[PDB]
Structure formats: structure tokens, C-alpha cells
Amino acid sequence: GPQTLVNSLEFLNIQKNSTMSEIRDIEVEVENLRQKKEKLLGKIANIEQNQLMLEDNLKQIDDR
Amino acid sequence: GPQTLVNSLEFLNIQKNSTMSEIRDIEVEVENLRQKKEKLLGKIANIEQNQLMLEDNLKQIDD
């Protein structure tokens, strides 16, 4: 009967909630990767800023 | 002195490049997860295209 099609709906619907939840898992990985990247850019920032407190000293001594 | 300073800048720079490398690595990983999410969002649509039809079919039946 037509209960078969209603059955297929609620199945598709189940599959959809499942697909959604996998999408949400993905959004989490992405966010957590996005932060790791931000930390890493902090490192660079500091490296560069440390480097320039050196390049300072070098070209100050480069005429002593 | 200038050697110490040159040795130091260079070392830091090794670190920099090697850090910019993990950054390129994350960026690839993130690209992949985006393409994965794009496909999954496609599939959400396929699911609903299908459901709509089944639902209309069930209405047609009501007549």
C-alpha cells in the first residue's frame, strides 16, 4: 500500500539527519584546523618580530 | 657579533619556512574537507528532490 512510500520517506529522512550530522562533524574539523593555522601564524608573527629585533642590532653594528 | 647575528637570523628563518609548511599542509586538508562537505550538501539535495516526489505521489493518491 501507500504506507510503503511513507516508509521510504522516513528512511530518506533518517539518512538525511545522518548526512547533516556528518556535515557538522566536518565543520568541526575545519574550525579546529582553522585555529591551528591561526596559532601557526602567530608563531610566524613572533619569528618575524624576533628577527627584526636582531636585524636592528646587525645594521647598528654594521657601522659600530 | 655579526656572525652570531647572521647564524641566528638564518636559524629563525629555517623555523619560519618549516612553519609556513604546516600552514600549507593544513590548507590542503581544509580544501579536502570543503570538497567533502560540498558533495555531502549535494546529497542533502538529492535526498530532498526524491522526498518531494514521493510526497507529491502520495498527494496524487489522495484524489
Side-chain angles (χ1 to χ4, degrees), chain A residues 3-54:
Chain A
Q3 173 68 20
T4 189
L5 300 188
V6 186
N7 284 358
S8 271
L9 280 184
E10 279 150 42
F11 278 78
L12 288 177
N13 198 93
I14 282 159
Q15 199 191 359
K16 183 168 59 169
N17 294 29
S18 143
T19 291
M20 274 324 285
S21 158
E22 182 172 352
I23 275 147
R24 283 184 220 105
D25 284 350
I26 293 202
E27 285 169 340
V28 137
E29 292 202 35
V30 167
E31 172 53 11
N32 103 54
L33 278 208
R34 207 84 107 312
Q35 68 204 11
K36 273 150 183 138
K37 188 234 193 93
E38 216 58 42
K39 260 225 134 184
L40 291 181
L41 289 164
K43 247 210 210 211
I44 312 263
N46 299 343
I47 285 175
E48 283 165 325
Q49 199 210 356
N50 205 333
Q51 288 187 317
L52 210 117
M53 300 202 90
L54 298 189

XYZ file of all heavy atoms in Angstrom, chain A residues 3-54:
424
model
N 1.443 3.014 2.511
C 2.358 3.053 3.636
C 3.791 2.751 3.194
O 4.718 3.093 3.900
C 1.925 2.087 4.734
C 2.913 1.926 5.900
C 3.032 3.177 6.749
O 2.152 4.046 6.739
N 4.127 3.284 7.478
N 3.986 2.128 2.033
C 5.348 1.829 1.603
C 6.101 3.105 1.282
O 7.311 3.183 1.472
C 5.451 0.803 0.415
O 6.819 0.425 0.233
C 4.984 1.370 -0.898
N 5.388 4.111 0.782
C 6.063 5.322 0.317
C 6.379 6.225 1.501
O 7.477 6.756 1.583
C 5.244 6.041 -0.728
C 4.892 5.326 -2.025
C 4.257 6.353 -2.928
C 6.077 4.679 -2.721
N 5.425 6.364 2.419
C 5.664 6.933 3.725
C 6.863 6.304 4.461
O 7.620 7.018 5.147
C 4.458 6.731 4.597
C 4.636 7.451 5.928
C 3.259 7.247 3.897
N 7.014 4.982 4.342
C 8.182 4.291 4.885
C 9.451 4.763 4.224
O 10.441 5.023 4.894
C 8.093 2.763 4.718
C 7.140 2.114 5.713
O 6.546 2.775 6.583
N 6.973 0.802 5.567
N 9.425 4.853 2.904
C 10.580 5.355 2.196
C 10.865 6.834 2.540
O 11.999 7.272 2.476
C 10.404 5.150 0.700
O 10.908 3.880 0.328
N 9.861 7.599 2.928
C 10.145 8.958 3.273
C 10.929 8.982 4.552
O 11.983 9.592 4.630
C 8.876 9.791 3.472
C 8.115 10.342 2.276
C 6.972 11.187 2.778
C 9.042 11.141 1.438
N 10.400 8.326 5.561
C 11.008 8.408 6.864
C 12.400 7.791 6.843
O 13.246 8.158 7.661
C 10.077 7.838 7.940
C 8.989 8.858 8.380
C 7.678 8.218 8.841
O 7.709 7.201 9.574
O 6.604 8.744 8.473
N 12.656 6.905 5.882
C 14.001 6.383 5.752
C 14.915 7.468 5.210
O 15.833 7.855 5.915
C 14.060 5.034 5.021
C 13.749 3.854 5.933
C 12.437 3.547 6.279
C 14.764 3.107 6.498
C 12.147 2.511 7.123
C 14.472 2.065 7.348
C 13.159 1.772 7.654
N 14.633 7.978 4.013
C 15.290 9.142 3.455
C 15.493 10.248 4.487
O 16.508 10.908 4.547
C 14.424 9.676 2.332
C 14.381 8.840 1.065
C 13.396 9.528 0.146
C 15.764 8.632 0.374
N 14.503 10.461 5.301
C 14.635 11.444 6.288
C 15.728 11.086 7.310
O 16.545 11.928 7.655
C 13.306 11.583 6.948
C 13.199 12.829 7.667
O 12.716 13.820 7.123
N 13.715 12.846 8.899
N 15.738 9.843 7.792
C 16.810 9.300 8.635
C 18.187 9.503 8.001
O 19.081 10.089 8.622
C 16.564 7.795 8.931
C 15.486 7.647 10.025
C 17.863 7.057 9.296
C 14.788 6.279 10.047
N 18.344 9.041 6.764
C 19.552 9.234 6.004
C 19.974 10.694 5.906
O 21.140 11.004 5.702
C 19.359 8.704 4.615
C 20.669 8.475 3.959
C 20.558 8.180 2.461
O 19.446 8.121 1.896
N 21.728 8.004 1.798
N 19.030 11.597 6.046
C 19.325 12.980 5.827
C 19.894 13.535 7.109
O 20.865 14.272 7.074
C 18.055 13.731 5.420
C 18.236 15.186 5.097
C 17.004 15.733 4.452
C 15.821 15.588 5.349
N 14.693 16.364 4.796
N 19.276 13.187 8.237
C 19.743 13.624 9.542
C 21.150 13.110 9.775
O 22.004 13.780 10.343
C 18.794 13.149 10.629
C 17.420 13.809 10.529
O 16.974 14.170 9.440
N 16.743 13.975 11.664
N 21.385 11.910 9.287
C 22.697 11.329 9.314
C 23.665 12.127 8.444
O 24.739 12.482 8.889
C 22.614 9.886 8.860
O 23.754 9.581 8.110
N 23.299 12.414 7.208
C 24.167 13.211 6.350
C 24.476 14.564 7.002
O 25.607 14.935 7.068
C 23.611 13.287 4.899
O 23.728 11.981 4.312
C 24.391 14.228 4.035
N 23.470 15.248 7.537
C 23.632 16.506 8.258
C 24.666 16.410 9.369
O 25.447 17.335 9.603
C 22.313 16.947 8.888
C 21.424 17.731 7.977
S 22.449 18.908 6.775
C 22.930 20.304 8.094
N 24.657 15.292 10.071
C 25.473 15.171 11.229
C 26.908 14.971 10.809
O 27.829 15.391 11.495
C 25.026 14.004 12.057
O 26.121 13.625 12.860
N 27.101 14.319 9.680
C 28.416 14.167 9.131
C 28.931 15.509 8.639
O 30.088 15.811 8.808
C 28.332 13.190 8.002
C 29.605 12.894 7.351
C 29.430 11.760 6.379
O 28.331 11.143 6.374
O 30.390 11.478 5.613
N 28.071 16.313 8.025
C 28.438 17.666 7.626
C 28.898 18.456 8.859
O 29.884 19.192 8.807
C 27.284 18.383 6.876
C 27.329 18.016 5.392
C 27.366 19.888 7.034
C 25.977 17.946 4.741
N 28.207 18.275 9.977
C 28.535 19.024 11.163
C 29.856 18.581 11.758
O 30.599 19.403 12.275
C 27.391 18.995 12.153
C 26.332 19.941 11.718
C 25.210 20.034 12.714
N 23.919 20.106 12.015
C 23.040 19.100 11.914
N 23.275 17.911 12.493
N 21.906 19.290 11.233
N 30.168 17.297 11.627
C 31.463 16.778 12.036
C 32.513 17.476 11.233
O 33.554 17.830 11.772
C 31.600 15.270 11.780
C 30.847 14.408 12.805
O 30.355 14.913 13.845
O 30.755 13.196 12.554
N 32.241 17.680 9.946
C 33.216 18.306 9.047
C 33.462 19.758 9.430
O 34.586 20.209 9.469
C 32.840 18.160 7.565
C 32.928 16.688 7.168
C 33.794 18.950 6.699
C 33.096 16.433 5.660
N 32.408 20.468 9.765
C 32.537 21.850 10.142
C 33.388 22.001 11.389
O 34.048 23.013 11.569
C 31.162 22.451 10.361
C 30.452 22.718 9.069
C 28.994 23.068 9.263
O 28.439 22.739 10.341
O 28.404 23.666 8.326
N 33.375 20.988 12.241
C 34.191 20.993 13.439
C 35.667 20.791 13.102
O 36.447 21.695 13.355
C 33.627 20.038 14.535
C 34.740 19.235 15.210
C 32.778 20.832 15.570
N 36.055 19.665 12.496
C 37.428 19.536 11.961
C 37.947 20.825 11.322
O 39.068 21.226 11.585
C 37.525 18.476 10.883
C 37.348 17.054 11.312
C 37.994 16.100 10.304
O 39.044 16.488 9.754
O 37.470 14.977 10.045
N 37.143 21.460 10.471
C 37.585 22.646 9.752
C 37.913 23.758 10.738
O 38.966 24.373 10.653
C 36.569 23.113 8.684
C 36.885 24.504 8.185
C 36.591 22.174 7.509
N 37.018 23.989 11.684
C 37.194 25.012 12.691
C 38.443 24.751 13.530
O 39.211 25.677 13.839
C 35.963 25.050 13.591
C 36.100 25.948 14.784
C 36.514 27.359 14.404
O 36.503 27.716 13.194
O 36.859 28.119 15.334
N 38.645 23.491 13.897
C 39.795 23.165 14.709
C 41.085 23.228 13.884
O 42.159 23.501 14.420
C 39.590 21.861 15.515
C 40.324 20.662 14.933
O 41.540 20.697 14.706
N 39.586 19.568 14.732
N 40.986 23.015 12.579
C 42.159 23.177 11.753
C 42.395 24.638 11.572
O 43.531 25.063 11.493
C 41.994 22.523 10.395
C 42.257 21.028 10.309
C 42.707 20.774 8.907
C 43.320 20.535 11.295
N 41.324 25.414 11.518
C 41.460 26.822 11.193
C 42.170 27.551 12.317
O 42.790 28.615 12.107
C 40.105 27.478 10.940
C 40.169 28.691 9.995
C 40.141 28.218 8.515
N 38.882 28.470 7.787
C 37.641 28.188 8.213
N 37.407 27.651 9.413
N 36.604 28.470 7.427
N 42.056 26.978 13.515
C 42.653 27.597 14.669
C 44.111 27.202 14.684
O 44.974 28.076 14.758
C 41.897 27.287 15.964
C 41.969 25.846 16.429
C 40.784 25.437 17.323
O 39.786 26.169 17.437
N 40.884 24.251 17.945
N 44.409 25.919 14.537
C 45.793 25.518 14.414
C 46.543 26.435 13.452
O 47.664 26.847 13.735
C 45.904 24.070 13.983
C 45.874 23.145 15.166
C 45.265 21.777 14.844
C 45.195 20.919 16.115
N 43.904 20.172 16.208
N 45.914 26.788 12.338
C 46.542 27.659 11.337
C 46.772 29.058 11.907
O 47.756 29.737 11.586
C 45.666 27.735 10.091
C 46.250 28.443 8.905
C 45.267 29.516 8.470
C 45.582 30.106 7.110
N 44.856 29.420 6.010
N 45.858 29.480 12.766
C 45.935 30.807 13.321
C 47.093 30.863 14.315
O 47.838 31.836 14.319
C 44.594 31.228 13.933
C 44.286 32.723 13.739
C 44.262 33.214 12.247
O 43.711 32.527 11.341
O 44.771 34.337 11.986
N 47.255 29.805 15.111
C 48.356 29.697 16.055
C 49.670 29.737 15.322
O 50.569 30.529 15.655
C 48.286 28.398 16.841
C 47.697 28.581 18.193
C 48.513 27.840 19.221
C 48.770 28.741 20.444
N 49.655 28.096 21.480
N 49.779 28.879 14.318
C 50.927 28.861 13.447
C 51.252 30.228 12.846
O 52.428 30.523 12.644
C 50.738 27.826 12.345
C 50.781 26.384 12.835
C 50.614 25.439 11.686
C 52.082 26.101 13.535
N 50.249 31.060 12.558
C 50.519 32.393 12.009
C 51.030 33.321 13.108
O 51.716 34.304 12.842
C 49.279 32.992 11.345
C 48.829 32.361 10.037
C 47.418 32.771 9.684
C 49.766 32.776 8.974
N 50.687 32.990 14.347
C 51.189 33.701 15.499
C 52.677 33.454 15.629
O 53.446 34.400 15.785
N 53.081 32.182 15.574
C 54.492 31.824 15.501
C 55.230 32.675 14.492
O 56.146 33.363 14.857
C 54.642 30.388 15.087
C 55.199 29.476 16.136
C 55.968 28.333 15.437
C 55.917 27.055 16.259
N 57.162 26.253 16.061
N 54.827 32.631 13.226
C 55.472 33.437 12.184
C 55.602 34.893 12.636
O 56.664 35.505 12.545
C 54.696 33.425 10.842
C 54.312 32.014 10.417
C 55.497 34.101 9.744
C 55.245 31.388 9.452
N 54.508 35.446 13.128
C 54.473 36.826 13.566
C 55.618 37.092 14.528
O 56.379 38.033 14.344
C 53.134 37.127 14.225
N 55.723 36.249 15.541
C 56.747 36.349 16.548
C 58.140 36.124 16.010
O 59.066 36.828 16.392
C 56.460 35.353 17.653
C 55.138 35.625 18.327
O 54.567 36.722 18.193
N 54.629 34.632 19.044
N 58.294 35.138 15.133
C 59.578 34.883 14.496
C 60.006 36.148 13.791
O 61.100 36.633 14.027
C 59.545 33.684 13.514
C 59.509 32.361 14.298
C 60.741 33.743 12.563
C 59.342 31.112 13.432
N 59.132 36.696 12.959
C 59.441 37.906 12.227
C 59.800 39.045 13.170
O 60.702 39.812 12.899
C 58.263 38.300 11.363
C 58.147 37.473 10.129
C 56.805 37.608 9.437
O 55.761 37.762 10.121
O 56.788 37.530 8.194
N 59.100 39.145 14.287
C 59.304 40.245 15.167
C 60.573 40.030 15.947
O 61.241 40.985 16.307
C 58.124 40.405 16.104
C 58.030 41.796 16.742
C 57.381 41.758 18.133
O 56.928 40.694 18.593
N 57.342 42.912 18.810
N 60.911 38.778 16.222
C 62.182 38.457 16.855
C 63.326 38.758 15.883
O 64.263 39.451 16.227
C 62.213 36.997 17.313
C 63.159 36.775 18.448
O 64.123 37.502 18.592
N 62.891 35.780 19.272
N 63.223 38.248 14.662
C 64.140 38.592 13.583
C 64.417 40.087 13.426
O 65.522 40.474 13.069
C 63.621 38.070 12.253
C 63.711 36.594 12.121
C 63.345 36.100 10.740
O 62.373 36.550 10.116
N 64.118 35.137 10.258
N 63.433 40.940 13.657
C 63.672 42.344 13.380
C 64.349 43.037 14.567
O 64.954 44.085 14.417
C 62.396 43.062 12.928
C 62.716 44.223 11.967
C 62.125 44.030 10.542
C 62.337 45.607 12.565
N 64.249 42.438 15.745
C 64.973 42.919 16.909
C 66.396 42.390 16.843
O 67.217 42.668 17.698
C 64.296 42.453 18.193
C 62.869 42.929 18.369
S 62.302 42.902 20.246
C 62.823 44.691 20.813
N 66.669 41.604 15.817
C 68.011 41.196 15.521
C 68.531 42.088 14.407
O 69.414 42.876 14.684
C 68.086 39.711 15.167
C 67.665 38.720 16.261
C 68.002 37.299 15.841
C 68.285 39.045 17.611
